[PDB]
Amino acid sequence: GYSSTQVLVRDATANDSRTPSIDTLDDLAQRSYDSVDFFEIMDMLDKRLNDKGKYWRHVAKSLTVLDYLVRFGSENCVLWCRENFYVIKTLREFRHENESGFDEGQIIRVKAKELVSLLNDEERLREERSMN
Template identity: 55%
Template sequence: MSATPKYAAKSTLRTLKNFSKGYTDMQAKVREATSNDPWGPSGTQMNELAMATHNPQAFLEIMEILDKRMNDKGKNWRHVFKALTVLDYLLHVGSEDVVKYARENVYIVKTLKEFQYLDEDGKDQGSNVRQKAKDITALLSDEARLKEERRSRNAMRDRMSGRAPGDSDAHTPVYDRPGMGDDDRDLQRALEESRRMAQTESKTRTSEEDDLQKALELSRKDEQDRLETIKKYNELSFAEDWEPDQKRPINQYEQQNNNNNNDFFGSDFGGRNNNNNNQNNNTNNNNFDAFASMNGF
């Protein structure tokens, strides 16, 4: 399966982390097989890890990373699910040390029967983890069943690889086991569902963003229409309030007020001024005559 740029970048970061954290080549392979990528682990990857468990040092390195992955939480549910898938494979095909280790640490697997995680869409992504944990717990509790399944699958693997029964040569390359087809299909179904949910979520986000953009555009248009209506209303009101005087009729009160003002300043006040002036002139004339008479003495 070809990696998208996003997951190719994640793979590069994983490689850098493997180097910076000092992970061995075998630990890096376990981390790759149990990554957060929405695919894998492949049968080839799991077969390589199963054969490596016959090496004591490699066995410890493999189980150390699987233990860390199974203790992961939340959004890294793929780490947990893939680690359980690899462990299930190793229990059937790996060394007896895997079976012993799993039984001694079965509490880790039992705890995962209660694993919970809901994604952003409310989908229960923890259900696959819980089911796989229940299957492994049941297998570990039934020693006879586990022995029979290990014998049967190892015999089939030997036939497919052309080796003699009982040959435990760990260096012989082994590829996909037909007996593990169901597990592979379960894993692929879970990962396919995860990819489908991611695509649906992406489409939903795009649709919601489009709807939001349309709503904003409509809101802006409504606001522009509202402002335009207010502007037109104000212009009409201004025109009515400031209509020219020659077009506006003069009421009776204004006409009467104008007439009274003209009579007051033009007629009455003017008449009184003339009378006062005449009286003053007469007085002046009389005074003059009196002095004139006095001059006659």
């Protein structure tokens, strides 16, 4: 019931201790230039970027994917972020503390602040994308 690309996004953002591999990130960036795949990718990231609490790994890993797409993927990836900028901005406020009382949300807030800064700086974004 999944397309190839959907399987790839699901694995890249799974609730586990792995970080998205460069191979998978590059696959997603390349596939984002195909409009059918682009929409499949973003729909899955939308779901997982909007997760919370003990499922924070879905959020963290989706933010990793999203940053990579903004830098290396199609222009459509940038367009999506600007449409959905409010949601990305809210991730700067993401909260979750684990059983040990450790703040698992901090990594998400840091990632989100860095992505918001990049998206707010058109020239820097365009320069990075051009060099990539």
